[PDB]
Amino acid sequence: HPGFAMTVVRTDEVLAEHILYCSRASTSMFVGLPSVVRREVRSDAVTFEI
């Protein structure tokens, strides 16, 4: 036994499932309009964006 003593610290992780309750009408939401943007046009394919 050497001169000093010592403490040891860990961490621990637990996969837990969770219950989320939310009261009524807590958030007012705004929903815009979807648009289409075409870009990165190549010779085998064309990429879009919505």
């Binding site: 943007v37 075409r38 870009r39 990165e40 046009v41 964006e49």
Partner: protein, 294 residues
């Protein structure tokens, strides 16, 4: 045809302090990592390679700059940054707000450089998100070279010291400037010097003898405006090599190899992507240019 737009999501509302600097630079070029519409703020800065606690190495930062795509700002909304994109080869408006100010005109040439004069001026920190944003500097191609010319000379003469007026000052017609060297990592700036020791001593082996004899006929009496480097005295080495007789077909094989290795010195003195400006407005500070490929 093709669209170009990058809108940047941001997780916190910006302050009125930091928005006033971003409203000041509404036309500016900053590089960013990926090619998408949505983008995190941790790619917008140049400071992923140049942070405060990390010692910056401006050659490696400039080496970083040719990889990335470059982008121009459109608006600064108080939540989302909105940018437009630069692709080779596309004509686009560019507007210089860049603080160590130089003057451009129509039919000029440009380059993009890391900030080499004032980092605190050319970088703004965002205390709301904790991540800082670093702006590069756009420079005409003559001073685009001439700043890199001084920084390669500087790492040569900081290693010999193991004073400042000759090593840290970039010269130009009308103005002198101060390079920002307090903390520089020389190891990526010395591998460029490691290849310079390769090219330059090969060029000292295949030296044309007649073009050495030309200076022995020139600088002793014939004084010219651009030969004031030698100050009127021949170097001691040049008298030693000229003992051989001249012959034409020796130098014909030599001067082609002298020619072919100066093709290689493009690769070590490269800038970033270049910008050939065709039309520049003066009072509006706008311009028009096509982005060159790397």
């Amino acid at each position: 045809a093709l669209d170009k737009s990058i809108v940047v999501n941001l997780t916190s509302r910006l302050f009125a302090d930091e928005l006033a600097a971003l409203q000041s630079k509404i036309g500016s070029v900053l590089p960013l990592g990926d090619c998408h519409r949505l983008q995190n703020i941790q790619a917008l800065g140049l400071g992923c390679v140049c942070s405060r606690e990390t010692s910056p190495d401006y050659i490696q930062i400039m080496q970083y700059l040719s990889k990335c795509t470059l982008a121009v700002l459109e608006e600064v909304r108080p939540d989302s940054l909105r940018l437009t994109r630069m692709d080779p080869s596309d004509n686009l408006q560019i507007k210089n707000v860049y603080a160590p100010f130089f003057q451009w005109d129509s039919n000029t040439q440009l380059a993009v450089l890391p900030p080499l004069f004032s980092r605190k001026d050319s970088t703004i920190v965002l205390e709301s998100n904790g991540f800082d944003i670093v702006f590069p500097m756009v420079v005409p191609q003559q001073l685009g070279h001439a700043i890199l010319q001084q920084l390669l000379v500087y790492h040569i003469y900081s290693k010999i010291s193991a004073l400042d007026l000759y090593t840290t000052n970039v010269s130009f017609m009308g103005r002198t400037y101060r390079l920002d060297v307090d903390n520089t990592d020389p190891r990526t700036a010395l591998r460029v010097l490691d290849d310079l020791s390769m090219y330059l001593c090969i060029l000292s082996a295949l030296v044309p003898r007649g073009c050495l004899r030309l200076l022995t006929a020139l600088v002793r009496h014939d004084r010219h405006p651009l030969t004031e480097v030698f100050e009127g005295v021949v170097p001691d080495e040049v008298t030693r090599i000229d003992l051989d007789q001249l012959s034409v077909p020796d130098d014909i094989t030599r001067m082609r190899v002298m020619f072919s290795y100066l093709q290689s010195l493009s690769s070590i003195f490269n800038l970033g992507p270049r910008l050939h400006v065709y039309a520049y407005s003066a009072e509006t500070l706008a311009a028009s240019c096509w982005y060159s490929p790397r």
